[PDB]
Amino acid sequence: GWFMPFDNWLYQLQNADPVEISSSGFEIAVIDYSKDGSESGEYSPEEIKIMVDAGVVPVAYVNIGQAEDYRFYWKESWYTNTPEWLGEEDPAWPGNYFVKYWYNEWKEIVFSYLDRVIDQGFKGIYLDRIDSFEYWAQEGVISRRSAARKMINFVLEIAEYVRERKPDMLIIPQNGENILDFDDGQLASTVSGWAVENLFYLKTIPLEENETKSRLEYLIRLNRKGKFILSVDYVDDGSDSFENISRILDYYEKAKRNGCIPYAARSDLELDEMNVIEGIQPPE
C-alpha cells in the first residue's frame, strides 16, 4: 500500500564519515553539516560528493527552532547584550536556546546556514524543532495559532529559499507534525517527507497505543499524499541480549506496517555512530 521510496535510512549527527557511509548500504543519510558542529569542521563539497557518487542521498540537519552556542552564527555579544528573540536555555539540551523564530534576525541566520548547506552539495534539509511553536504557546508569549502560523510560514520561506537555488531539494521536518492542524494544505504539499522520533518507543520503553495512533493520523495522511516518513526510535540498548534484539525487530515491524521507514538508534541518544545491527540494519 505504502509509499516507501527508500529501503532504509541513517541518522548520525556526530563523527559521520562519508567514506564509511558511502559503502554502508544506507540509501539516505541525515548528518550534521560539520564533523564536530563548528565552522572549522564544515564538510567540504568533496567530502559530500563521495556520498553522492556512491548513490547515497545526504541530507543536512538544521535546527530552526533553537540557537546552538557552538555554531558559526553564535556571537559572544549575545551573553552581554542579549537579543529579544534569544530565549532561555533548554533544560534537556545544554547549549541550545529557544528562539523566537519569527523575528527577522533569526530567519536570516537560518537562511545563511542554508546557504552554506547548499554550497556543500547536500540534497535535502532536515529541520529540527518545528515543535518550538508548542514551546512558545505554552509559555504564553504568543497564541498557539500565531505560533503555528509563524512556524508554517517560516518553513514555507525556507522552502522558497533553497528551491530558488536547487529546485529538487528535499525538505523534511522533524516532529511537530500536529502543526498540520493549522495548515491549509500548502505545507503538506511543500515537504518531501516528515521525520519523527519516539513513535512506538521512548528509548527502550513502548508507548501507549493511543499516543502512537494519534501521531500516525498525521503521518498516514501525508503518506497517502506521496510523502515519505522516516522513523527513528532510540531502542537499541547496545547489548545483543534477547530482550533488546526482540525490541528492535518489534519496532522494525511496527514501523513498516504503517509506512514508516525505521532506524533503530542507541538509547543514549548521542547519534555518534553509524549503528549497524547484523542482518537487520541495513536490511538483508
Residue numbers in the entry: 29 to 312
What does the paper say about this structure?
Endo-galactosaminidases are an underexplored family of enzymes involved in the degradation of galactosaminogalactan (GAG) and other galactosamine-containing cationic exopolysaccharides produced by fungi and bacteria. Whereas the fungal enzyme belongs to family GH114, the two bacterial enzymes do not lie in the current GH families but instead define a new family, GH191. The TIM-barrel core structure with fully conserved active-site residues and a negatively charged substrate crevice is conserved among all the families. The putative active-site residues (Asp156/Glu225 for TmGH191, Asp323/Glu391 for Env-GH191 and Asp157/Glu225 for FsGH114) overlap well with the experimentally verified nucleophile and general acid/base Asp189/Glu247 in Ega3, Asp196/Glu222 in Sph3 and Asp160/Glu223 in PelAH.
We could not detect any binding, or enzymatic cleavage of the GAG oligomers, for the T. maritima enzyme, which raises the question as to whether the T. maritima enzyme is an endo-galactosaminidase or whether GAG is not a substrate for this family. The TmGH191 crystals all showed a varying degree of twinning. The structure is composed of tightly packed trimers stacked on each other along their common pseudo-threefold axis. A pair of adjacent trimers form the asymmetric unit, with the two trimers having slightly different orientations (11.5° rotation around the common axis). The stacks of trimers pack into a sparse honeycomb-like structure with wide wells around the pseudo-63 axis and a solvent content of 82.5%. Sph3 has a rather less charged surface due to its activity on neutral GlcNAcylated GAG. A closer inspection shows that the substrate crevice is partially blocked in ‘apo’ TmGH191, especially over the active site via the loop between βi2 and βi3, with Trp121 bridging the active site and blocking access towards the putative −1 subsite. The TmGH191 crystals prepared in this study were soaked with GalN and GalNAc, and a data set was obtained for a GalN-soaked crystal. While no distinct density for a bound carbohydrate was observed, difference density in the substrate-binding crevice of TmGH191 suggests that something has bound, although it could not be conclusively modelled. Some flexibility in the side chain of Trp121 was noted when comparing the native and soaked structures.
